[PDB]
Structures are given as C-alpha cells and as structure tokens.
C-alpha cells in the first residue's frame, strides 16, 4: 500500500 519504513528497517 505504500508505507514508509521504520528507522531501522534498512540498518
């Protein structure tokens, strides 16, 4: 649906 990822989703 297009959600923004959390701060640590790309750590």
């Amino acid at each position, epitope marked *: *649906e297009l*959600l*923004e*990822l*959390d*701060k*640590w*989703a790309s*750590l």
Partner: antibody
Framework: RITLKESGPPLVKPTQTLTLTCSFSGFSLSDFGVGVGWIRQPPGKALEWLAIIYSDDDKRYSPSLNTRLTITKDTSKNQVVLVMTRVSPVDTATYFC????????????????????????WGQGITVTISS | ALQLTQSPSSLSASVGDRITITCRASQGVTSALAWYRQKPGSPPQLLIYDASSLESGVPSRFSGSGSGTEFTLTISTLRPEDFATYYCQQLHFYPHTFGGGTRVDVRR
C-alpha cells in the same frame, strides 16, 4: 533502571492546545538510536500510536494527526514534549510516553537491531479530559 | 494504512490453561512485532520483542512466534495475573500500528 512519567493538565477545552511532557531517567536522548514515543488510549479503547522522536532528532507522526502534533525533546532536561493543537472530545484519553531501545552495539558498532522492535518501558500515563 | 488484526478479540480461560493469541498484518512486517499485556489501570507491559524474543524479567510461560504477516502469542500456563488485555504492535512501518487487543477473562 528506566522510568518515564507524563505530566500536563488533566482538563482542556475544545479548540485548545494540549501540551504534554515526558520526564525520564535512566537514559539519554543523546544515546545512540534511542527513541521516546507517545501512545494514547481512549477509555475502554485500544492503543493508538501518536509519534516518536529519536536522539538524532528524527521525528515521525501518525498521518491522521500530523497537522495537530508536534514532538520535541530537550536533551539536557531529559524531556520530550508533545503538543496537540485544536483538541476535541475525541482526544480525551490516557496519554503514555514510552522508551524505545536503540540498536545493540559492540565496541561502538551496531550489531543487533532486534531490540528496537518494541516500546520496552512505559510511563504510568496521564489522563486528559476534553470538555467545554 | 497497515491493518493489524488480533484474534480472537475476546477469550475465556481458566488458571492453568494454555492460550494462544494471534495478530495478522495486511503487509509483511518482518520480525518487527511486539506483544504487551495490560492490566486495568496500568500501562501496557512488554512481554515479547522482535516477534519471538523474550523480554528480560518476563516469565518464561510467555512465548512468541511467527514473522511476516502471522504472529502468535502463547501463554503456556495461565496465571491469575494474566487475565487482562493483550496487544500487538508493528514497528516495521510508520506509523507503528497497534492491534485492537484481545481480552482474556475468567471462564465460567
């Protein structure tokens, strides 16, 4: 030991601005990856996420509330403030602030992000009623 | 946005029972999910973090499993202080969604 505590006015009138304060101890908003968030709960209802702020000053807000919310921290006083403008009766709820761990580090190097997936310590909560 | 549905919404049980609660997400949230117990008049208390990690100080009768879109919480042996409301929280996407909760009361 980590402890948070919410303070503010128990009563506010519709159209008014509600300012809430989360005073904590046991951690710093200068500590790596640490966050402090706000969650609310209308009486007899479910938890509803409002916002979060991190020690690097990164901020996020609930999309259905972002035109009325402002979150700010005061690193030196160990506080986080939440401002909600133009409140109405649906805003009456118990407001909670909570701590979010930052990533685990080993010799100043993030090695585990698992502990960030939760709000681990909560304040007791403050009850706010909105009535004219 | 993301939907976080708990099942069941209500549940009756007795001391000693093994109960399971579930939380489904409308989209994959990886392992970024937390479980909390909330007794009336108190703030939610963390039980499980990152879908299956047992939070320190929390009794071993609490366990969490699953990833992606299906999560479950199980309390192997219900104690009296477990009669309460449970919540699940997603932290993979902003906003950090909470489930609707499932109430656990005394069966009669």
């Amino acid at each position: 030991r980590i402890t948070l505590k919410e303070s503010g006015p128990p009563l506010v009138k519709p159209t008014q601005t509600l300012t809430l304060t989360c005073s904590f101890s046991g951690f710093s908003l200068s500590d790596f990856g640490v966050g402090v968030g706000w969650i609310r709960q209308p009486p007899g209802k479910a938890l509803e996420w409002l916002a979060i702020i991190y020690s690097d000053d990164d901020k996020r807000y609930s999309p259905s509330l972002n035109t009325r919310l402002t979150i700010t921290k005061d690193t030196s006083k160990n506080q986080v403030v939440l401002v909600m403008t133009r409140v109405s009766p649906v805003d009456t709820a118990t407001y909670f602030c909570a701590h979010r761990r930052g990533p685990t580090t080993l010799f100043g190097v993030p090695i585990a992000r698992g502990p960030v997936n939760a709000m681990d310590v909560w304040g007791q909560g403050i009850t706010v009623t909105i009535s004219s | 946005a993301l939907q976080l549905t708990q099942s069941p919404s209500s549940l009756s049980a007795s001391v000693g029972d093994r109960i399971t609660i579930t939380c489904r997400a409308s989209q994959g949230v990886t392992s970024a999910l937390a479980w909390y117990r909330q007794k009336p008049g108190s703030p939610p208390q963390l039980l499980i973090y990152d879908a299956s990690s047992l939070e320190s100080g929390v009794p071993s009768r609490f366990s969490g499993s699953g990833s992606g879109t299906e999560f479950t919480l199980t309390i192997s042996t219900l104690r009296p202080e477990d009669f309460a409301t449970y919540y699940c929280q997603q932290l993979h996407f902003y906003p950090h969604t909470f489930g609707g909760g499932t109430r656990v009361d005394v069966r009669r």
